[PDB]
Design a protein around this nucleic acid. Sequence first.
RNA 1: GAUAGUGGCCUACCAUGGUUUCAACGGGUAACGGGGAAUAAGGGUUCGAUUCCGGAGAGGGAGCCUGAGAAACGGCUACCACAUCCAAGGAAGGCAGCAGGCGCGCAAAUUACCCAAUCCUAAUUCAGGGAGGUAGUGACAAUAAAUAACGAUACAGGGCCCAUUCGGGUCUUGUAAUUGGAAUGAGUACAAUGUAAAUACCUUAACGAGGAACAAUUGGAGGGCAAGUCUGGUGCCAGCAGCCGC
RNA 2: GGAAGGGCACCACCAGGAGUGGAGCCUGCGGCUUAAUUUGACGGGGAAACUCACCAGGUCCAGACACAAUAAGGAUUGACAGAUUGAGAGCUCUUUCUUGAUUUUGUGGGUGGUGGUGCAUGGCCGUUCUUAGUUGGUGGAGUGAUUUGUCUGCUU
RNA 3: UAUUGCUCUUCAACGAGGAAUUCCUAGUAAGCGCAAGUCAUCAGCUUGCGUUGAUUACGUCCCUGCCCUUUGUACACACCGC
RNA 4: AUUUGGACAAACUUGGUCAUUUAGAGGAACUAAAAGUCGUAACAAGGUUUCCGUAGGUGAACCUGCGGAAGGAUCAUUAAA
Lengths: 197, 271
Amino acid sequence: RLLRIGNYKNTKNRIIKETKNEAQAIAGDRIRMFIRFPKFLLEKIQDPKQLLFAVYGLLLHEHKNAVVNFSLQRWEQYDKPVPSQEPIVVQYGVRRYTIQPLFSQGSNSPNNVHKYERFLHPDTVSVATCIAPVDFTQSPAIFFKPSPTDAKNIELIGHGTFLNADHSRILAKRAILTGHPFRFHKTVVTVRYMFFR
Amino acid sequence: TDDFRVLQAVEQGSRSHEVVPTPLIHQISGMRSQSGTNRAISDLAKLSLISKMRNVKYDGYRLTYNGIDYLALKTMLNRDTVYSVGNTIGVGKESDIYKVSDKNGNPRVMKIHRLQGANWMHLSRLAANKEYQFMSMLYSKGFKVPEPFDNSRHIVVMELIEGYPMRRLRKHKNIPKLYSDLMCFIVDLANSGLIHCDFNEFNIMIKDKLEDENDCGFVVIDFPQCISIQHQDADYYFQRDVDCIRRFFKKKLKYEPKPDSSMLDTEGFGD
RNA sequence: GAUAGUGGCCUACCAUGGUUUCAACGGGUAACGGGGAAUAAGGGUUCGAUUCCGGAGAGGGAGCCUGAGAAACGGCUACCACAUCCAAGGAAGGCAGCAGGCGCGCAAAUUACCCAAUCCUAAUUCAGGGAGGUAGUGACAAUAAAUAACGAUACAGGGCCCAUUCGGGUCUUGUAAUUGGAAUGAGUACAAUGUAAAUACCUUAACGAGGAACAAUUGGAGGGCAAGUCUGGUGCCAGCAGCCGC
RNA sequence: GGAAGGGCACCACCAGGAGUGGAGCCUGCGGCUUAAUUUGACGGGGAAACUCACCAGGUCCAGACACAAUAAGGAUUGACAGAUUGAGAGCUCUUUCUUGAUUUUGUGGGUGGUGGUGCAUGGCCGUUCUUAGUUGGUGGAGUGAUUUGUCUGCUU
RNA sequence: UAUUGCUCUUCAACGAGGAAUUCCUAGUAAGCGCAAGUCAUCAGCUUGCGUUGAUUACGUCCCUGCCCUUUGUACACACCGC
RNA sequence: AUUUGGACAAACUUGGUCAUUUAGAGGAACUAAAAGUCGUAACAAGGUUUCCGUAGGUGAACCUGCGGAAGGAUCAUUAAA
């Protein structure tokens, strides 16, 4: 039930062309905009000269999920580990979504088959593979972890970039079965404690 | 696909020159680095699929009989053939006969030919192609004979047939029609223009379908003995075929011919 | 005729000349010319917008008043191109001067102080000068040269002669974030000098280091070409990249 | 260099002889099967036990020293006979009792290297090239590399 | 799943054997048994011994190969179509 | 103030020509860190004195006329010393 866009870059640029075709009122104008807005959210309508109230437009089907891939580099002097399973809030575009991302290594695969890591790799850049709705701008991304203990309600895990809307990028967990070659009739070797049945 | 394709490429890197050096197997493959080529050649040499000839100032690579048939298996992966290999029934002179099976699970027959550097391989290839074309000629004329599947450059894969030789066959009920069959079939051979001089007991193979309908056939495997009628000595070859049939039917089946058997001068008004 | 004045400078009337392979004429220039600059054993090669001399121009063309001197742009007039104010009638404009802004681009400073020097102008010793000088910014280049220096100990050596052995001294190393007493400016700063007034420099009271941080970096360690026979990871972004490459 | 020429051989051919592969069986290998048909390419590998290196099971005996506890009224180690005990042998506790720190339990660097594979050193049974044409010492001539020796002939 | 030996009985394929294969020139082949090691019991296992004792070469490199050499040479790596 | 005629001469318009900044629109061709298809990929091999000028037919290629060059491997055999 995911939105499967074939090639992100060309379709992205084409939809940007469609958007520039469909620019109904250009930058530099003043608009009386009527937005569909429910009754119960009027309780957070604040004094607009007292609270900042910005309005950002969206594009076609940035609301629909895909398997999207983010870049991620660890924040500096952030030695704390984080697994591929914790909820972590991601700022991309303008939207800050709680995501449980799969941490993968971005080394190029001909068949687009990648590893699954348990944790974040402590040294290099990983890829966050996750079911999340799409961006069309390749925006900067910033990853954090909401915490009221800190001054800000934010613990900065790192930053990154909305890389791709790629669903062929799939992951695999390795399990190693290990045994000790105890005694050497040098070619035909008895190996001890690998399997038990 | 890829490793088999590169092994096909170094198979095609054999029909260029004589005994192939190391950098030609580096470059005919056209692979990335020292890794794939050198570790592949070492996997060949440790499985005895290749050998090193170091003739002064000159490294070279000598392919033995081992590292060919995989490609034939790859050639037979293309042509829907065998998946599992090995059951020894018969180690012949110019071929080694094995019982194999496909992906479909039917058992078949794998005659590998071993008849080095080019000539062992290439003469096994000529033998397999010649026997495949002779099998094609026999099946095109309509001779009851095993049906060929393929001739994977030097390994012939064909069907298995439920038969046992005539040395362990005591008799049948219709002995004079069997004599008329084994006369008229050599008549049909002379009408083909050929004489199979080794028409012995071990040649003739009988499949046995039922005991009521009597709808059976025969299998004749005499390939390095068939001689055209134009040759110097075909007269007593034909007569040896006829008379071995007759002396077997006198000794085993205790049957003497009431009609006179065909001569070569009888069959000179044939084909 | 015109001019300050010869002169096709121009005008009337005559002739039919003048230049050219010793390259005329046309074309190009990311061409202001020179004194000079960089680099070499010699001969040469390449730059010179740029501090001195000469030329030319003040958005592009043209014309002119005044005056000894201007075809003058911090003088005028008209057109062309931009552009300012406006009560819509009109009225003003030239930073390739000193500062400064936009644009442009790899590429370039303060909307500071002063006429005290050096000179210049005027009716003139006195007034005036973004000429010029001073300071800021400034790793454009250039000069000089701090980041430590002595001891004693031990310990390990080495050498000098006496060694028959010990030990008798002379050195010189290495270490030991072992110890000792010294020296001094970077920096801060009374004062004084400095200067038009200052800032800075040269002096100098009083502070100012064991310097485990008053912490020297930039590029390298296959060969060219001085420097690894070292360890770990890599070996799915990796035999790799001035050249050769393993 | 896919030139040609000689040996010189019954693991080559001709003259043949005995034959094998044809029948049955002995025996070695492969394959299948298994719980194992142990394992090599004759292995002195002739064979119910052994040899046995493989399966179905049942078992002993592990482990040093250090070190915290535990003590001779008892930690325990052994001579036992009975309850045993499944197929056999062990094993546990009731006495007759030796008991005597050999303690017992759980650990810490490793005794044990009769746990071993790699680095060096020295070296060895079968050996085998059982060296039947080559080597180098120079000469000279050629920048190097090379010529000759190592040859026209004849002969073993 | 008989170690083996003895007695009687049961009496199978097998009517000189294919494609192909091995060894060999005088007491050698071939036939024969015996003895010794494998041996607790047996050989169809290996080795020596003796009895009887052929045919046919004493030639060849024609097949099989094995070498020994001679030197035409490296296209010293060339063009291509692909 | 206005005004005649001169030389100086900025500019303006009209055409026609090159030299361009463009924008658009029309077409054509080259490529793939792109992806699948058949043709000879997964197919056989083949030519091999080499060139130079000129002319022709050609086909995936290349051959044939005419004339030059060696940038091609002189043995023997007559005489000489």
